[PDB]
Amino acid sequence: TTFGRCAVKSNQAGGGTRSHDWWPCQLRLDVLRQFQPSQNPLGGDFDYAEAFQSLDYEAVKKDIAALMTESQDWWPADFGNYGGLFVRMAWHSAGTYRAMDGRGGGGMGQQRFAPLNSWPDNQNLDKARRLIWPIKQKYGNKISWADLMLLTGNVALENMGFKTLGFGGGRADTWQSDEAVYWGAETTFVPQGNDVRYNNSVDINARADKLEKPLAATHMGLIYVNPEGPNGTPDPAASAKDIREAFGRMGMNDTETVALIAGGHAFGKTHGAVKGSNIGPAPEAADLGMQGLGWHNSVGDGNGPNQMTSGLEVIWTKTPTKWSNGYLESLINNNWTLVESPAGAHQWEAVNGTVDYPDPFDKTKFRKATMLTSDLALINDPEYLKISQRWLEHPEELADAFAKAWFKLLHRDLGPTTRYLGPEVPKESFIWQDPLPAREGDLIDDADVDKLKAAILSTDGLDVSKLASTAMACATTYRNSDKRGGCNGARIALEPQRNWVSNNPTQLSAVLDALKKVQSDFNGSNGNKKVSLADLIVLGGTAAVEKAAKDAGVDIKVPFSAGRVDATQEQTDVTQFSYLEPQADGFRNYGRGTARARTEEIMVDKASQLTLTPPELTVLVGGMRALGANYDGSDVGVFTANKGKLTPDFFVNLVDMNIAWTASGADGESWVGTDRKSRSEKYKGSRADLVFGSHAELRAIAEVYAENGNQEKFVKDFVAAWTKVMNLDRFDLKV
Amino acid sequence: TFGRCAVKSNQAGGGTRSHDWWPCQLRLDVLRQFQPSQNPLGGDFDYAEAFQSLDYEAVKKDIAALMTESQDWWPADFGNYGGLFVRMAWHSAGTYRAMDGRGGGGMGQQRFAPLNSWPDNQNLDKARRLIWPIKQKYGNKISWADLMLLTGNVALENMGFKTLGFGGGRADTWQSDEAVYWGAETTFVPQGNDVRYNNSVDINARADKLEKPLAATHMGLIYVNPEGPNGTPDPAASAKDIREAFGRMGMNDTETVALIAGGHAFGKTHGAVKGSNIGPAPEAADLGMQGLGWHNSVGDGNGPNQMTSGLEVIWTKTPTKWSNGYLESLINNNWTLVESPAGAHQWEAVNGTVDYPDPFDKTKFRKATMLTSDLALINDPEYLKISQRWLEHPEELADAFAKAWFKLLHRDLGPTTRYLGPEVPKESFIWQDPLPAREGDLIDDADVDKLKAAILSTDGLDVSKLASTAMACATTYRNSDKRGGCNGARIALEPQRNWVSNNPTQLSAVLDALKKVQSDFNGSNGNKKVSLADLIVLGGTAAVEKAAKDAGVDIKVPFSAGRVDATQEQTDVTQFSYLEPQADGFRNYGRGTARARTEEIMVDKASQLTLTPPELTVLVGGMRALGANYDGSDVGVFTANKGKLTPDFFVNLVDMNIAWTASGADGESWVGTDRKSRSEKYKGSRADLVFGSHAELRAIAEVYAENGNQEKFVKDFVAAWTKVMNLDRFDLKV
């Protein structure tokens, strides 16, 4: 293939054949080397929360609203108002989110980097970002690009007559393309870009509910669905099935989906004035003269009446700069006929309809009503039809649903409400925020923590292995992409996590009963002090790690940060939490991978979501094995004669050349370590164990911890990594 | 299919990536390697302190004993791993290319992809595994980089060849160095060379046409093909490849013959079974192999069944002891072309003595054998004269080999101030880019304050010239081989003083002015003396400080005294030719080639300076604000306050009222036109405009263009300036 190869082969700056070219199936650590603090121009010590709280937020909003109608000659505003274009920018920034893996969304501002800056569906959003740049120049570090793109759409809706619930800032900027996201395996974009995600099916009605997991778009390079219909076939009934699937994969139900589409398509228009052959390279492929912009259009000045974005030429309402109910009115009251846009694409026009839809530049010109196939979807499915019919007669119910769904869209990947900043954060708490009760009571102090650690360690049924394993099981549900999971809330005690087979539900039950005894004893006796179950789960694992280090000859402070609260079941939605359930866990030697995701690839992926470096992933696995911390208490990977003592025995014995390693099963998941001289079977290992002795960069770390004399360094590094992981969700304190 | 896995992972980076869609776009990956977070020792680990505390003699004693402690999983030929360990060290050091300074043993990269899995490194996985117990014993106080070389050094000495000594000091690295251009072919040897010979298969005519800056005849080889060019068993053509490849590694004829005749005193090659019996290389092998590869399924895969290169040659009758048997055999035997057991072309003395030993059976003997690359040395007129001389005067070979082996192992270690341990050779060699002892006593802060005031009021000097000259001197530094930088004032010597990129007539007038400041100081300050090298850096540094003051920011710009001035005798014009830049984005110099755009050359140079993307970006914008172009032009100088340290370069770059269009056919010149007045306002280069085009670089430009960030700009510039000026300061250190 020519695909993925430049016709000129550079000899500079990484040019040449590379290791991943020769050995493309080998595990890559790239996803654990992103987002490092050197790469950040602002430095590691910059506190975005402090900066945003000092922002003159009201003046930022007034500057945005003034920009909306200050038309720039290099991209003139339709109807004299950029509001629709700015709503699209915000919706596309937020619109990449996938609920199952928690990736995409607006929370990293990734629309400004490859590949999102150059996806076909983001065509001419380079102009939109450029138009808002002067607001970022004025306000500097005190508002992120990530926050600004979404605030701009929020302010746009409010200045076009639609009052929102409010807004929360808090998204710090990122500084490189996030190459950890599986957007798909296709080698083409829309109109192609979907053979792999449909497994070669082309029957568009039958396949619609069979989109490859965890994807949430129907072609590579789209936000959700194809506006001409599935595979460009202008069938509204099949389009509706694609919409249900895609919006479902983004965490939206039918009410939310109709409210978002009918709410957004009140505003603006689509652009399809000239054929695609007039349009130049996307931003990542454009020449230096374009200075970060792309899709240069060679007809006229390439803008104004010649704008070309999607290829469609649809104006939904008679007032595209003002909130209305004209979208549903047109959709339901007109009869529709299939026509072509000027650029050749399929759309729908009203039969015998009024010629009163305004032109964006010529006051003398009007058009008939028009719709996309994906808008006709909403009256060609029974459930969408019933919602649209109700909202035709009750526009106030659409406005309520749209306010709620728009707020959810923009904030779904922001994390707990302790992350949300600014003066207009909505007061209602929503289930998709994974709510927590407010912390109350006088917080436990150092002496209470010392008393609780001793009580925990002296309780029947609690040992170092079980305490450590339970804490980590609770902690590794965290993922940095959408800031969901972690130990705050004590959700391991609730459905679904209490019944996850990867948590060993019978053992977990007995551990949690013992912790609840510690809790009853303490609460029953220490005046104004109560301790949460969440702090006891974390404190028990922390106490176990401290004890295991002492038992290994090292006196170390293992620091504990108190103040977690306990969630209720009503704040813990089963569907949302089911997305956090692991299929394999390398920290606790659970499960295994599949053909397209090997055991060790799942481990690296999870480490990236925990923000771990390669040294931190390595040290954690080796210490969990030394602690005997497997999910089922097995000996797999437990390469030590001192289980429960925090030593680097795992690494020492893994690298010992007197042990030969051979496959025991057929499927490559189980390994036996045999003493070469005696021929006795000494050890059993998994792929998560043996990858550390196979991958050249991971093995180099294994060797550090296997070196004579490094027992103390091993202990210090394990404790640092343990503390980092236990605290990932502590946004009430600071990250 | 090439460079694609048959199974497409959906985790850990699986899926189509940005580089796949837009493979021609500039990539910043080489500025993101070797980050301190990635180093398991921590960014505060000091390798030099660890190594100086090492019990060095005990390490060498334990290496020496390991040589004859055969391990059953890879039994030692003749009972001695010495030859194997000499090969390990020579392959570690043997990837070096003098022109670009990449490869060599100084980063210990043989333990990572791709070098761990190149065909020429077959079975060195075993060699590395055999020495791992010594690394495990001594811990952090010896690096893998130092150990692999020290092991070969000790192996020579324990097989009867006393070396010049050794220097340690190579700190380990912790990821594959994906900045090196090894070539553009999509196959390894026996293929791997269509591109580097532009599809020529005329083995004599093409030999001196090898693609620059490569130093091997096929992808995956160290230097040349042991069976002849493209496997053609023609010794005279092989000799032309050896001279080309070794020259590209910085070795001349005498050094070349010494290295090959010296090395092949020892050990043997391995070709006992055909290649179909050999499994995947390390990076392709299954988890059971635990980082090893090339599993051989015949017998136990080892001992008599060893298979490495496919050849089965034993050069001397005493493969564990230094001798003159290589030359004695080469010159005196009549050679016939034969096939090894694995099917490769080699040469045998079919009517010679049957007294060459077997590595495992003391009762079994063989005839004399050679490679085609060995017969090369008697099939070229200059190599033959050397070979004949040394046959008769073997002490001259021993002298040449000790010096060339020292050069091989230490060519990328950098200045002598970096060399560690108790047996560093006392001779100063030209390829070490030597520096003297200082003159008189070290300037103090009072002397620095007087010299800054003098420099900023001297005829022929100003802010722009001073900043340009210091950066010109600094950017010769390259971290791959630790060559270049400002220590030595080598801008003032040949060849740098006559480089077109240094504007020789301006430079001369700047250097004469700094020498006048120097003459005033030296001898009127008792025994205090200042070097020209310190005055070049101090003058640029004082200019940056004043330019910040004039932009409204009061900042103390640090200065570290103590550089010395190199002599011209210690500055070889060919050695320094390798540092001459094709383009220099910091000073808006030069143009790209048919294989690398100007902006790619700049990112490459930034990687050699260890810069991050924000450091690269801030330096370019500040150099433009200072008016520090090599030729004093206004290209990229997007400010009305030239000489004042403002972020005007970034503000004006991103101003939408300016439209940028190509002016030259070559893609190298651009004009910025004011869209309202229709007037040409600015001229820019590709090094200027990339900061407004690449999305990750433009994100950094925006920071510096934002209101309020004028002081941050100055702070970040000053930090980056100090880092670059000090890269070669291993005397402090660096």
Ligand code: HEM
């Ligand atoms: C099934 C889901 C959807 C599809 C297929 C779709 C499709 C499109 C297409 C093809 C365009 C025209 C781009 C152009 O040529 O300029 C567009 C424009 C727009 N869409 Fe959507 N859309 C969907 C959902 C949404 C949502 C959820 C919102 C926001 C809540 C949104 C708001 C907008 C706005 C405001 C515009 C007008 C942009 C302008 O005036 O420049 N759409 N849509």
Ligand code: HEM
């Ligand atoms: C024209 C340059 C050279 C070529 C083409 C070449 C080729 C080879 C080949 C094909 C092998 C056999 C590998 C195997 O089958 O085990 C080998 C082995 C060896 N080479 Fe070279 N060589 C070159 C230069 C050097 C140099 C410069 C040195 C060191 C100063 C060196 C030292 C050795 C040693 C000691 C062995 C034996 C390894 C053992 O005993 O396992 N060679 N050479």
